[PDB]
Design a protein around this ligand. Structure first.
Ligand SMILES: [Ca+2]
Lengths: 156, 223
């Protein structure tokens, strides 16, 4: 299926910027978890607001927007000045950001009831879920069967 | 299309826009009832728009016809994008005229260096995003099998060719998928994929149409 944003418009492929928000904690961003100095681990912001770090979704296929059948890379388009460039997602085993060339595209978006979830694939895929259900350890990690239900709010 | 030019109106009369509420992919008219596109452009609901030049303005040469049959190649693989080809049968035949016309299937594979025309309403920028109202055109050479496979180690099957510039600049891009590469009055390519658009050593990769002539002719005849 075609993946839509919260305004009903199709989510763009390798273009635009979206917060990944809970379908109802705030939107995904980064937090520091055995990463040294910089927040390098994908986390849901603790505070209950529809905001996060903006994300861009990317398939090498030259369709204008994102479908549930596409293989994706995902990167934060904006991040702390210390973070790597690009701030590309890669892998409880958590999701962190990195530079390394790795030409994989292991993420997809899938329908999840009325909204979506994110999966990680090797096409055998596993659900990406919320590690701990608290303030500061709500890290995005691999978690079969407990997917984090998300929607996509386009940034202006 | 990055590094291209705005095509003269209806000068690519075989180009279609695949529309599911907005433009998302291109296609090529190969006879009055059938369009060829990319298989990753597959949806259960597609409207085909022929005769278009400005896709956001009704100018008077448009024909809007719903897709009836929507058939991906049986061996399409969505992860590798091998056999990335699809046929659409229109629910009524297009009216053929100077602005809506057919493009011939290939009578053989194109040599390295053959010049092609590539067109679409995809992104016109290599950094950031810009989606044009007007159809964009690009003239580009078919690249050697050697250059192609060098640019994308492990990812080029015998059903893929590269077209464009190792130096980047000029390339197709997101929103151009499924569209035509036409070289000497033949369809030799379908927009398929790349790393980014218009980056150095990352040329456009295109479905090698000459491999599928028989698949196409047979699918038409059986439907
Ligand atoms: Ca128009």
């Amino acid at each position: 299926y075609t993946v839509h944003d919260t305004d009903g418009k199709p989510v763009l492929n390798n273009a635009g910027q979206y917060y990944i928000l809970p379908a109802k904690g705030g939107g995904l961003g980064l937090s520091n978890d055995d990463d040294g100095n910089c927040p390098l681990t994908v986390s849901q912001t603790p505070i209950d607001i529809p905001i996060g770090l903006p994300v861009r979704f990317s398939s090498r296929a030259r369709i204008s927007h994102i479908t549930t059948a596409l293989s994706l890379n995902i990167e934060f388009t904006i991040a702390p000045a210390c973070a790597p460039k690009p701030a590309r997602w890669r892998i409880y085993t958590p999701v962190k950001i990195s530079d390394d060339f790795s030409s994989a595209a292991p993420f997809q978006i899938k329908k999840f009831e009325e909204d979506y979830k994110l999966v990680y694939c090797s096409r055998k895929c596993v659900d990406l879920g919320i590690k701990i259900d608290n303030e500061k350890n709500r890290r995005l990690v691999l978690k079969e069967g407990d997917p984090f239900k998300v929607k996509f709010k386009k940034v202006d | 299309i990055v590094g291209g030019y705005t095509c003269a109106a209806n000068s690519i009369p075989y180009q279609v826009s695949l529309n599911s509420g907005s433009h998302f992919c291109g296609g090529s008219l190969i006879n009055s009832q059938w369009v060829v596109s990319a298989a990753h452009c597959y949806k259960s609901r597609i409207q085909v728009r022929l005769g278009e030049h400005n896709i956001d303005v009704l100018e008077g040469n448009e024909q809007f016809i719903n897709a009836a049959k929507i058939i991906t190649h049986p061996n399409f693989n969505g992860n590798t994008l091998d056999n990335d080809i699809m046929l659409i049968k229109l629910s009524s035949p297009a009216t053929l005229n100077s602005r809506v016309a057919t493009v011939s299937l290939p009578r053989s594979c194109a040599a390295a260096g053959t010049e092609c025309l590539i067109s679409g309403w995809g992104n016109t920028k290599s950094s950031g995003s810009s989606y044009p109202s007007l159809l964009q055109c690009l003239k580009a050479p078919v690249l050697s099998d050697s250059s192609c496979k060098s640019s994308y180690p492990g990812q080029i099957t015998g059903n893929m060719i590269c077209v464009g510039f190792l130096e980047g600049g000029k390339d197709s891009c997101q929103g151009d998928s499924g569209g035509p590469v036409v070289c000497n009055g033949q369809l030799q390519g379908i927009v398929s994929w790349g790393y980014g658009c218009a980056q150095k050593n990352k040329p456009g990769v295109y479905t090698k149409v000459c491999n599928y002539v028989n698949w196409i002719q047979q699918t038409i005849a059986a439907n």
